[PDB]
Amino acid sequence: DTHWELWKKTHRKQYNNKVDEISRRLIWEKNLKYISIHNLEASLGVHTYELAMNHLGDMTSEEVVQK
Amino acid sequence: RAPDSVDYRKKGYVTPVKNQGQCGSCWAFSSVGALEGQLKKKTGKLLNLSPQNLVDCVSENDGCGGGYMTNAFQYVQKNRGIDSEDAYPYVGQEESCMYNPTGKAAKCRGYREIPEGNEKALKRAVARVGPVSVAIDASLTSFQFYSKGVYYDESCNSDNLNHAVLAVGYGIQKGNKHWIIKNSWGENWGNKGYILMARNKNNACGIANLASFPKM
Ligand SMILES: *C(=N)N(CC(=O)N(C)Cc1ccccc1)NC(=O)OC(C)(C)C
Ligand SMILES: [Mg+2]
Numbered sequence: 663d664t665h666w667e668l669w670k671k672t673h674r675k676q677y678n679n680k681v682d683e684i685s686r687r688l689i690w691e692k693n694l695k696y697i698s699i700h701n702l703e704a705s706l707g708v709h710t711y712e713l714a715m716n717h718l719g720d721m722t723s724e725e726v727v728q729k
Numbered sequence: 730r731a732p733d734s735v736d737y738r739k740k741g742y743v744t745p746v747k748n749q750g751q752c753g754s755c756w757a758f759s760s761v762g763a764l765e766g767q768l769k770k771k772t773g774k775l776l777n778l779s780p781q782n783l784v785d786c787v788s789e790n791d792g793c794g795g796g797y798m799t800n801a802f803q804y805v806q807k808n809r810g811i812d813s814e815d816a817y818p819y820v821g822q823e824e825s826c827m828y829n830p831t832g833k834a835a836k837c838r839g840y841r842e843i844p845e846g847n848e849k850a851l852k853r854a855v856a857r858v859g860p861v862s863v864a865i866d867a868s869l870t871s872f873q874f875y876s877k878g879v880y881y882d883e884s885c886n887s888d889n890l891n892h893a894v895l896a897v898g899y900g901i902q903k904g905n906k907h908w909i910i911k912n913s914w915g916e917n918w919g920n921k922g923y924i925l926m927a928r929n930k931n932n933a934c935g936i937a938n939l940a941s942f943p944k945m
């Protein structure tokens with residue numbers, strides 16, 4: 663997909679094989695969906711803050727601060 | 730009257746946002762940021778101190794495997810100095826302690842700990858001393874993708890400290906009190922590498938649970 667390719671190129675992402683890349687693409691798709699919902703909720707006064715996709719889009723929140 | 734607000738970025742106490750990368754050196758970035766603030770306050774000069782010096786040389790910490798800001802300050806003291814970024818650059822992986830006294834940019838005569846969970850004491854420290862090293866729960870997706878506004882997530886665990894950052898001030902936005910927090914995940918995270926974290930919301934993310942600063 664054009665967006666996934668541009669994301670990987672921009673953040674210089676590399677994967678070890680097709681399974682690893684698809685598994686990381688799946689986490690990224692789930693994070694995009696999370697961001698969209700939270701921001702909708704923020705537009706309705708549910709949150710005092712908003713979110714955006716960044717270089718950590720293909721990781722779990724736990725992975726970011728663990729291993 | 731004027732609001733009770735502080736932002737040390739406006740006084741040139743704060744260096745630009747760094748990127749720790751794929752290394753668990755958040756504590757080293759937090760430590761140098763606190764040291765940078767005090768060096769500016771003492772000598773009037775603002776320069777990048779070496780996180781890599783702390784990663785490669787603080788034996789009581791684990792370089793890319795985590796550590797404490799207090800242990801970093803104690804090393805700088807016992808070592809009678811820390812080098813600049815220029816004399817000891819960041820490579821984002823631990824190596825052997827190539828500390829060089831010729832590149833010394835700062836010293837430390839001890840450190841201070843804010844009383845556990847006391848946000849008012851943290852506030853007074855930031856107001857009177859300058860940037861203060863703090864630890865938080867950074868483990869939520871809400872933090873991972875933070876972009877703008879005042880970060881307040883009730884799921885955030887103050888008994889689960891896993892990340893070190895720098896409190897460079899405090900204020901209020903849209904009636905929400907905040908801490909001005911400098912992160913070490915580069916300028917592509919947050920608001921150009923910064924996050925506003927909720928202030929006086931029952932010690933949200935443990936912001937005042939493990940807060941410390943160097944004496945210079
Ligand atoms: C920050 N870079 N950092 C290290 C890290 O993320 N590790 C090693 C994972 C981890 C940290 C804390 C608890 C469990 C796992 N964080 C860090 O050093 O955190 C403190 C709380 C300052 C030790
Ligand atoms: Mg999560």
